[PDB]
Amino acid sequence: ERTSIAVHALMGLPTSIGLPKVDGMSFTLYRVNEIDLTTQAGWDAASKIKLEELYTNGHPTDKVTKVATKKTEGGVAKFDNLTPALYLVVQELNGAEAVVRSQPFLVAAPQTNPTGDGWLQDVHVYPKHQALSEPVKTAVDPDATQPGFSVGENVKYRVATKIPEIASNTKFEGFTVADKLPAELGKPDTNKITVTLGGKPINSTDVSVQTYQVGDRTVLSVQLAGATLQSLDQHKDQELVVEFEAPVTKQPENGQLDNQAWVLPSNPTAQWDPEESGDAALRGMPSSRVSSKFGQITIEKSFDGNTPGADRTATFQLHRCEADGSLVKSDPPISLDGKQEFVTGQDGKAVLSGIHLGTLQLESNVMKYTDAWAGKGTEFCLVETATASGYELLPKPVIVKLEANESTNVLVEQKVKIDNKK
Ligand SMILES: [Ca+2]
Ligand code: NA
Known part of the structure; x- marks a missing residue:
């Protein structure tokens, strides 16, 4: 039978x-x-x-x-x-x-x-x-000297994971939080990776913080072991919070700097890529998504309707302005990949890349876009600081419309044609 x-x-x-x-x-x-x-x-x-x-x-x-x-x-x-x-x-x-x-x-x-x-x-x-509950991932600007985390600055991420209540007298086999950083980020600063459980730091012996490369991306892994792991079942409904900073090294080609983390209730012996996905793969619980939106401004400069050429050059600085086109009080020039001014080439072009505009992330449980430049005027603008001999400097800032929103899923661009006049 x-x-x-x-x-x-x-x-x-x-x-x-x-x-x-x-x-x-x-x-x-x-x-x-x-x-x-x-x-x-x-x-x-x-x-x-x-x-x-x-x-x-x-x-x-x-x-x-x-x-x-x-x-x-x-x-x-x-x-x-x-x-x-x-x-x-x-x-x-x-x-x-x-x-x-x-x-x-x-x-x-x-x-x-x-x-x-x-x-x-x-x-x-x-x-x-x-x-397992979906971990909540957010991004934070770790240095407010310049709004946001444009190329050449650091981004900080926070991953909050709830410890579930598990079966009476059972133990967690493991607890790993892994994050395969987007490719546009450098390696996480070792001294800025933090781990807390219910608001409290965890002793170093119990927590293994590792990075490893998978293709052109870094995975950051945090694994609980030792007494912390054995007693993790007594922290039901507390949050395990992992935070880290990493350098934004280049503009994402599609404008999207996207991050997700994954929680796995296991401590793999092999270096785990959480975004691997054949049938054999250890399946993690993915976090909420974070997407930071980037923009690029292209200046196209002419001199009396002509291409500038070899002896005509102008220089601009990027600024924030108020609704009336005037500069925000005490507005500093905006730095992009460590440059604070932009000089036109013989072809008339100057490219201002890697402007972080804002971020879409989960807030009190709903996806919300926040403008990284909120409260610093209303728009970007360009100030012409130098020009060619015999031409007049533009006396007012040039307003440049460049913004993103919750639907933005490609690189935000604005072309600015400027004809220097005699
Ligand atoms: Ca900043
Ligand atoms: Na000019």
């Missing part, structure tokens, strides 16, 4: 068949070798088993043999056409969403109907897991 094991992945704390079922939860079925439950030797052996003998350190031992691996659909993962045996069901870390997984457990097939009336060939089991 063929048997079946239907695995219903329940979300909740074991006190439970009324709990919600979850799709996309991944389980592997193993057969327990050399246990025949139809004999007294096999039955006595199976009441003797210690789970560590069958599965330990995140992996199946020689004592078991893999049958199949499957994801829940409609709340259930059904393993059909099974020969009678003792089975071990193992929830895996490669489900559709990251969860605090169920521990391995034994299932006999077939079983006696609990009523006594005959055999149950189709068995049902109800392992519980706990959900």
Whole structure:
């Protein structure tokens, strides 16, 4: 007689068949070798088993043999056409969403109907897991000398992760927060990476802060181990907060400087790329997205309607102005990649790149765009500081409209044609 094991992945704390079922939860079925439950030797052996003998350190031992691996659909993962045996069901870390997984457990097939009336060939089991909340990622300007984090300045990120309540008398296997920085960022400043749990620093021995390169991007990894990890289950609903700064080294080609972090309830031995995604991949819980919007101004200078050429040059500074076109009080020139003035080339062009305009991120739970230049006038403007011999300097700032908003998903550009006059 063929048997079946239907695995219903329940979300909740074991006190439970009324709990919600979850799709996309991944389980592997193993057969327990050399246990025949139809004999007294096999039955006595199976009441003797210690789970560590069958599965330990995140992996199946020689004592078991893999049958199949499957994801829940409609709340259930059904393993059909099974020969009678003792089975071990193992929830895996490669489900559709990251969860605090169920521990391995034994299932006999077939079983006696609990009523006594005959055999149950189709068995049902109800392992519980706990959900991970989506971490909240934000960006912060760490130095307010110039608004925002234009190319040549540092950005700071904050990743706030909630510690879930897990099953009574169980422990977290691990706890990693990983962030694959966008390519436009340099390596995080070692002295500015911080980690707190419920507002308190964590002792260094317990927290491993690592960076590693994957292609042209740096991954920052923070992993909890030691006593901190073993006691993490006592910090339910507290926040683990990771903050770091990194240099904005170039303008994103599409204007989008985008960051996400990922939480994994496991401490991989291999260097984990959280944005890897084949079926075998350890699935993290991704954070809320942060997108910072960049803009570029291109000046096209002429001198009496002609290309400037080899003996005609003008210089501009970028500023903020008020609604009436006048400079914001005490407005300093704006620095971009360490330049505070911009000289026109023989072709008349000057490019002001890597202007950070503002940031879209989650605020009190809703995606919100904030203008990085809020409160410093209303627009950008250019001041002409030098020109060619025989020409007049522009006496007023040149207003340049350059802004972003929550829908912005390409590089914001403005071309400014200026014809120096005689
Ligand atoms: Ca700044
Ligand atoms: Na001029």
